Amino acid sequence: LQALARTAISAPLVTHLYTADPSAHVFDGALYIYPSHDLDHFDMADYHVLRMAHPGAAVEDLGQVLHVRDVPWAQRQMWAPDAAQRNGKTYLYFPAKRADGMFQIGVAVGDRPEGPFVAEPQPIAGTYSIDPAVLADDDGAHYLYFGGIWGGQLQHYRDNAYAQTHQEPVGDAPALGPRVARLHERMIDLAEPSREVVILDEHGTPLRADDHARRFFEGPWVHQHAGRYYLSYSTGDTHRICYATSDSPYGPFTYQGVLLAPVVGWTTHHSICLFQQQWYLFYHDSVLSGGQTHLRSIKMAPLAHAADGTIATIYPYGEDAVSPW
Ligand SMILES: [Ca+2]
């Protein structure tokens, strides 16, 4: 697979550290990226913030802005984060693991996009599992999406309650979807208990647990375009970013297709962000590290919505490349 490094459509945004799970936002007139920081096993411990001043600019590492040692409730595994702004504050949302082994989502508050961020002493009540994404709705509301199965533990929850015997559904049972909750105006609490986000097939039927090509695995992201909501996410063991659409941030979302073909390294994770004239897909892969799943680099590619609202598949090493998966 050494050909893939040669025909990659994107270079690593930074190479002096390993980065993953990019959440891109335009805050205060610039592009800010909030990724995970892979350490040279997914044992990440801290977050950096990166910035691009304008379209085409060199990427700045603004340095470390939060470390798990400053998060009283969390012991380890600072995974895919996100950020939001409200009332002149910037909020850093992040999944991390408690000493008792459970993932939950917490938040840290700062006065600027680049921090420093001060972590709340407890996680956000009502959250669990991983991969937060916070949608700043055009109407002023903020919504928190989250969830990931397998290592993300979402499969142990139903209706927001944990049980040891809750497992991943199988067969004809509906696959699990991400969770969503409107955030409180104070941003560090939910305004409501989270709800299931339902993803439907083209016939209006919820996706099956045994449909691993399409069913939700982790890393939800929502963006607005042309009066609809786009939910996009990783399918995990089939290595796709897929997307689905709805007239509501709550769904249900109807499956549309594959947004990003498989990348090098087992995980795939992304965000979609509008910057000046252009939509961009931010994603990651493991080429920098020579194909090591746990050492990634974030990347970006331009993204286009078609007249009919669809998004064409992005092929990270070219459409003619041998797929890494
Ligand atoms: Ca994410």
Author numbering: 10 to 49, 60 to 344
What do the authors report?
GH43 enzymes cleave glycosidic bonds with inversion of the anomeric configuration. Therefore, based on these functional and structural observations, XacGH43_1 can be defined as a GH43 non-reducing-end xylose-releasing exo-oligoxylanase.
To understand the catalytic route for the exo-oligoxylanase activity in the GH43 family, the native enzyme and the complex with product (xylose) were crystallized. The structure of the free enzyme shows a glycerol molecule occupying the −1 subsite. The crystal structure shows the presence of a Ca2+ ion near the −1 subsite. The Ca2+ ion is coordinated by the His288 Nε2 atom and by six water molecules in a pentagonal bipyramidal coordination geometry. The water molecules coordinating the calcium ion are connected to the carbonyl groups of residues Ser32, Asp150, Pro151, Ala99, Pro100, Asp30, His289, Gly238, and Pro239. The catalytic triad, inferred from structural comparisons with other members of subfamily GH43_115,17, is not interacting with the calcium ion directly. In particular, residues Asp150 (pKa modulator) and Asp30 (general base) are part of the second coordination sphere of the calcium ion and might interact with His288, while Glu237 (the general acid) is far from the Ca2+ ion. All structures show that the active site is clearly blocked at the negative subsites, having only the highly conserved −1 subsite, which supports the exo mode of action, with the recognition of the non-reducing ends of the substrate.
